[PDB]
Amino acid sequence: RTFDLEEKLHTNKYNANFVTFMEGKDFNVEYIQRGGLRDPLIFKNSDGLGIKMPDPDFTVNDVKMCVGSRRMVDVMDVNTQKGIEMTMAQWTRYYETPEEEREKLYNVISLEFSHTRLENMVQRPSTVDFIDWVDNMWPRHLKEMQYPKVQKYCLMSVRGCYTDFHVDFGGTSVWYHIHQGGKVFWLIPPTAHNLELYENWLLSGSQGDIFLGDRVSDCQRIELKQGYTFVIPSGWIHAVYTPTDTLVFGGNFLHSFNIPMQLKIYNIEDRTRVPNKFRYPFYYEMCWYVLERYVYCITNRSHLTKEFQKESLSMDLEQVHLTHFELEGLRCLVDKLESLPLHKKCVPTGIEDEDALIADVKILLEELANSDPKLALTGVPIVQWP
Ligand SMILES: O=C(O)CCC(=O)C(=O)O
Ligand SMILES: [Fe+2]
């Protein structure tokens, strides 16, 4: 902590214009097919989004219950890092310690609660339910851990905590709803140039002597108030600061319209030697399912084992025009997966022949090469009914 955060919080120089303000109603799948979720969005009203949030007088304490006290939570010491020593019990008591009495500066930005009752209490925007790689790609009988359980998040921050510049794991995109309080964001776009600066910055030790926002040409500091829903696209480098005690509900997802950046970031994580602890769980296994789903949804030719096919069929019994976004995306998924050394192709377990799959994708990618953008804008993803 060499640079003055206060300065970075009050100078009016991060005036870039990256964020697009819109109405939740306008946020549908045709929008994603049209823009490819390349812009960070802010919805002042939750109207049209299809989200559901607890009675707003909900408090951290109300959270220490639903999840479960004595339920170890990863808590970071915004003055250095880690200290996940505590559970909700110790934490809740910390949240309510008047600022001055407050000894440490703690932040909880990892509580993933889909396990707890809190789940059916919180609901993400329906558009995100349409493109989420998990709900839509991973075999459903495996989520009814052997499935990426990194979907719903509950961040709880105190006045003063600051999360330094980073790009969310796996190049995931993220949605946040400020339930109580507010947050200040510094946004930097995944410009090839910026993404280089950022990687070199993580190698030099992410010094903390340099404010990354000052290293780039254009940065936008945004302010999220109570009630806003925030969407950050895959790849963006951002830093966050909690001006006051805030409670946020959100999540990190993967979709099929910005696959190249998603892989772009995984490879940064690979070169930056990020510990396998903080890696998106089952990244490549997921990728294999994405392809198998595409081939099956477009071609009706399944590539899962008979067993898996049976479950998918049981559960149920209870041409096509792609955007360039997906065509270029599938291309990367194919090339990426092929450049993986044999022992580490992480072929999921529900897949018969990966080669037959890969062969079928390459053929699929050439037959569909000429897709009409207009005709592609179907308003609904081709991969549906997980
Ligand atoms: O609010 C914060 O401190 C960090 C938010 C977060 O989870 C992220 O930017 O990845
Ligand atoms: Fe983030």
Swiss-Prot record:
The JmjC domain, residue ranges: 113-270
Reported function: Histone demethylase that specifically demethylates 'Lys-36' of histone H3, thereby playing a central role in histone code. Preferentially demethylates dimethylated H3 'Lys-36' residue while it has weak or no activity for mono- and tri-methylated H3 'Lys-36'. May also recognize and bind to some phosphorylated proteins and promote their ubiquitination and degradation. Required to maintain the heterochromatic state. Associates with centromeres and represses transcription of small non-coding RNAs that are encoded by the clusters of satellite repeats at the centromere.
Species per Swiss-Prot/TrEMBL record: Homo sapiens
Effect of H166A: Abolishes histone demethylase activity. No loss of its ability to repress the transcriptional activator activity of the CLOCK-BMAL1 heterodimer
Subunit architecture: Interacts with CBX5/HP1A; the interaction promotes CBX5 localization to chromatin. The SKP1-KDM2A complex interacts with UBB. Part of a SCF (SKP1-cullin-F-box) protein ligase complex.
Name of the protein in its database record: Lysine-specific demethylase 2A
UniProt gene name: KDM2A
Tissue: Widely expressed, with highest levels in brain, testis and ovary, followed by lung.
Binding, Fe cation: H166, D168, H238
Compartments it resides in: Nucleus, Nucleoplasm; Chromosome
Lineage: Eukaryota, Metazoa, Chordata, Craniata, Vertebrata
